[PDB]
Write a structure and sequence with these properties.
Elements lengths: L9 H10 L5 H13 L5 H9 L2 H11 L4 H14 L3 H7 L4 H11 L3 H14 L3 H9 L2 H12 L5 H17 L3 H8 L5 H9 L5 H14 L3 H9 L2 H10 L7 H14 L3 H10 L1 H5 L8 H14 L4 H8 L2 H11 L5 H18 L2 H10 L1 H8 L5 H28 L2 H7 L6 H9 L13 H5 L9 H16 L2
PDB class: oncoprotein
Keywords: armadillo GEF, oncoprotein
Assembly: monomeric
Length: 473
Amino acid sequence: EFMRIPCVDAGLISPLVQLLNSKDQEVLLQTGRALGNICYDSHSLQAQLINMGVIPTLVKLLGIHCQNAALTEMCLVAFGNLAELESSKEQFASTNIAEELVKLFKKQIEHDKREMIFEVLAPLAENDAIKLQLVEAGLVECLLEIVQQKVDSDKEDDITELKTGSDLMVLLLLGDESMQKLFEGGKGSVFQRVLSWIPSNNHQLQLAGALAIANFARNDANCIHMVDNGIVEKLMDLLDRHVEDGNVTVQHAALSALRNLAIPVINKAKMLSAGVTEAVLKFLKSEMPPVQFKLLGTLRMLIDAQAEAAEQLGKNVKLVERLVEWCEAKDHAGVMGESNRLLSALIRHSKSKDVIKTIVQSGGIKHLVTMATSEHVIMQNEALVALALIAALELGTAEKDLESAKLVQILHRLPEIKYNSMVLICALMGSECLHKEVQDLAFLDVVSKLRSHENKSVAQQASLTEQRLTVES
């Protein structure tokens, strides 16, 4: 009888899975290769892969035949293909794969075979439990030894292993549990080694070291510890060495660490006192957007409620002119947005007339005005509050640019907490150039708030805005 033959499916695969428990090594080699070569792209196929327990069965086989190079190699190949599925990694994370791979790795004295294991470790280590399991199984001390063994070596294979090893270490630091384990309250081997990597001449170790700090610096307690222990000084020294003709990769990582470190309130004053601003502004002339992005982010974290710092930066005319420049960089959204946010924050946290004037003289108003129409609500009322401060402090010097930028027209079209637009209008009300107000038909909208807006905040200010817009204009 004529048979319909479907695409590869459970019927083809089921038989092969049953063979995984054979004591014949040829059979195991045939079936294992076959199973690792099949593409589990269908959802029913991966379901079958998971439900028939192929992954745990292969990890088991790797345990039993880790002395057989043919079987071991086939498992590694199989694992490399299987590992690429997120659902598969989850399953790997309930097995002994981490320990089995480290034991195996420790046994190897051939670069090629090490590399085979690296290519299984890397995808698997995207899973956070696997990361933690690798740390517990001793992977990092292997990695650190490899780096130490290969620093200062020009052998192609030495630099490649140092690279792959140091990168894998960083990957381990992206998982929260693995990272914290390695941090070990600020005395962990990795943290302390990295203090020797950052001041070194090896760019890959500078890079890996700076990234290790960045990834350690992902909660308050770690950041506070590292700042109390002088990490900011080493990162500034690292940055200084890369001002002139630097590696952008290392500049970015270093600035990324500083940005993370500046997040805790307690850190901000300490970093400012250490002179971190001066180190970071040496990269204003960078044309590399990632560097720009992270230098901007760092400054913004550092001024977060630090008025003296916001004031010194807001009056730095080179900084401000550069910000206005980067607000016009249309292709690089991150730096555009960070630059806009920095302009706003400079005003909100300093509340200084001098920074406000520096910003108007430099062209900043139109950019703040445009930011108020941002799709992100946080950025809109950051724009508004900054606008309100400039109304209240330097309306005279600004109203020309505020006219040009058509702010009152924008305010009208404006939502929820963007009700702060009403507060801005009432402060703009005392403007010569910005006469209407009235002509804009704002009296039709102002009192019409009442409630709803249902919020007691969004309702109550309507009475104030209605009393003001009725008594005048």
